[PDB]
Amino acid sequence: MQYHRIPHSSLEVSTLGLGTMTFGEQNSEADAHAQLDYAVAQGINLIDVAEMYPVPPRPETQGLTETYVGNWLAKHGSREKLIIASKVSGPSRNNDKGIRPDQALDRKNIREALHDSLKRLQTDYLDLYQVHWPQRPTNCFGKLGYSWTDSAPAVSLLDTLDALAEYQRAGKIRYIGVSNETAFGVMRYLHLADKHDLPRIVTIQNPYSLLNRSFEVGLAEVSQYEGVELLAYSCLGFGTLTGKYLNGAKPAGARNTLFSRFTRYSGEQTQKAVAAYVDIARRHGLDPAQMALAFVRRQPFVASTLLGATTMDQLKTNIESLHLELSEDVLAEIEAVHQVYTYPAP
Ligand SMILES: NC(=O)C1=CN([C@@H]2O[C@H](COP(=O)(O)OP(=O)(O)OC[C@H]3O[C@@H](n4cnc5c(N)ncnc54)[C@H](OP(=O)(O)O)[C@@H]3O)[C@@H](O)[C@H]2O)C=CC1
Fold it and tell me: What are the residues facing 176 on neighbouring strands?
């Protein structure tokens, strides 16, 4: 395993991290524990969870992911070597059911969320606690460009940062991060930390893959100058970059076959781009999943790649991507496809 030191922190993260959002839905608790054991045996220390997992989310299963991870933590011990990252939900969205009434990123909601997460995770602190998505409407979750809003948000970034600061002082969270944010939002949080002597966010967890490189327009430069580094998610486009859905295929047991609500990587242009990337991989003798992962790993703004797997063989293949280094010729072909299909799946 390779590791990466996050600026302004004591976190040295494994270059690959283990995402967990299927734990409790597609994956059982024994599957979860087998993946956590395997990941740690391969040197991964970063485990990413959320109060809303697993997905697709519903009240009946809400919190099962954290509970499975906590049950594992209780048994395997060596807690201190792990970097357990969780999240507090933004305002309810996408017609999904909330966890709390009139859910917002204010002190009351954050206090409740954090305590419930710590209880399920069976630990007294989180290494990283992340704002899952912004309070204000912005360009995340399928929206490439920003649309002007009329309504000022109900809770400001300073409100949210001040609330988090209390729990950092209390030692319940070591570091704070954001998720599904933008260049404006990151810079505002950083401005506020300096102006008000408040904690400085250290990471942003945003989608990044061959199908959504939009982080490069505004956020990559923030990462270089400010040190807020990317924890990249959905680096296989929900599994589409493996090529498993090409030519109308709907493999049994796969995410998009089971849950047709997941459309983020199913648009017309996206499907054309997937076929093009898989073609590059096949011509260069690469596994499409590994090529997609190695492309994300090599970016200088990526601190860690959050892997997703529903089987042990998938997880083994994905961790083995560490050893793939992309050639100049493959990189140039990728650039050519990206010119034709630019940010197709925001
Ligand atoms: N902050 C946020 O808003 C978000 C955070 N995340 C984080 O990122 C993690 C990863 O996200 P996710 O969307 O799962 O990541 P990917 O885009 O990498 O999709 C992973 C899925 O693809 C399939 N797959 C994985 N590897 C292979 C392989 N080698 N061959 C064939 N199929 C494969 C599996 O699904 P299947 O077997 O069903 O086909 C797996 O669940 C999450 O667990 C979560 O921690 C994710 C989304 C949003």
Answer: 129
Q: ω before 300 within 30° of 0 (cis)?
A: no
Q: Distance between alpha carbon 90 and the CA centroid of its chain, in Å? A: 15
Domain span holding position 174:
1-346
State the DSSP string of 35-49: HHHHHHHTT--EEE-
Distance CA 207, CA 328 (A): 24
For residue 238, give the CATH number of its domain.
3.20.20.100
Give the active site residue among 3, 38, 53, 167.
53
Ligand 1 near 314 CB (within 6 A) = yes
Total domains in the chain come to 1
Fill in the DSSP letter of residue 96: P
Q: Binding residue per annotation — 248? A: no
Buried b (16+ CB within 10 A) or exposed e, 298-318: ebebbbbbbbbbbeeebbebb
Long-range contacts of 28-34 (CB under 8 A, 24+ apart): 29/68, 29/71, 31/310, 31/311, 32/65, 32/68, 32/69, 32/72, 33/68, 33/71, 33/72, 34/312
Residue 53 is a catalytic residue: yes
